[PDB]
Design a binder for this molecule. Structure first.
Ligand SMILES: O=C(O)C(=O)Cc1ccccc1
Ligand SMILES: [Co+2]
Ligand SMILES: [Co+2]
Ligand SMILES: [Fe+3]
Ligand SMILES: [Fe+3]
Length: 224
């Protein structure tokens, strides 16, 4: 209805969560899904836990030793992702001298079955550009597609559209305008958006440089 009301739906205001061990997170929520961007300090353990929600994790900057179930893997920035199905224990250590920036999606929606690869970690692959100039890379599982998109500056654009797939995402680069229904927000590093099925959305990068985004489809839209 109103601007504020749409903004709070589609571009929820984040809360900052701080842990005793020094991890800070920015949490944004719409209904069945939470996006959490975490800053994990050098040489820090993230204690293992487990929960009924599924969790998808990816590193955006730095390098993170991640453990899902009994699989431990080194996660490289923008080249790694895993799914921890409901109740599978997971934890991590930033074993480096550098901060780690990560994103987690935590989700529990009716009528979704949360499969994962047998060893949890997904394999990235390129495809042809989504639109010319807009390079994308994906991880895909039966119920979720993760699309990393580089939107060029100087008017790189995703035309305004809708689809039945739910689509949630986060700017992980400089910035661009994103619009959902009646609300346009200037995306910054970390800004999350949530589109329910059929809500119209599009984006335009008017800055002078490319911006990156992680865009996640429930269920897959491109690699079905
Ligand atoms: O492919 C789609 O459905 C999209 O919405 C893609 C997208 C990519 C980058 C910014 C906004 C939307
Ligand atoms: Co978790
Ligand atoms: Co879309
Ligand atoms: Fe939802
Ligand atoms: Fe320009």
């Amino acid at each position: 209805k109103t601007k504020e009301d749409m903004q709070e739906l589609y571009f929820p205001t984040p809360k900052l969560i701080e842990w005793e061990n020094g991890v800070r997170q920015y949490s944004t929520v719409r209904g069945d899904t939470e996006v959490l961007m975490s800053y994990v300090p050098p040489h820090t353990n993230v204690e293992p836990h487990q929960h009924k929600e599924v969790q998808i994790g990816m590193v955006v900057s730095g390098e993170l030793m991640m453990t899902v179930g009994d699989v431990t893997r080194k996660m490289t920035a923008l080249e790694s992702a895993y799914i921890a199905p409901p109740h599978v224990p997971h934890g991590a250590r930033n074993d480096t001298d550098q901060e780690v920036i990560a994103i987690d999606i935590k989700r529990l929606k009716a009528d979704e079955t949360y499969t994962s690869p047998e060893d949890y970690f997904l394999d990235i692959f390129k495809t042809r550009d989504l639109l010319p100039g807009m390079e994308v890379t994906f991880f895909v599982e039966d119920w979720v597609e993760i699309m990393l998109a580089k939107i060029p500056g100087n008017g790189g654009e995703m035309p305004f559209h809708k689809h039945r797939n739910e689509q949630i995402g986060i700017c992980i680069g400089g910035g661009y305008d994103m619009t959902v229904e009646g609300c346009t927000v200037e995306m910054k590093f970390g800004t999350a958006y949530f589109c329910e099925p059929r809500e119209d959305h599009g984006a335009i990068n008017r800055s002078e440089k490319e911006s990156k985004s992680i865009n996640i489809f429930f269920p897959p839209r491109y690699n079905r």
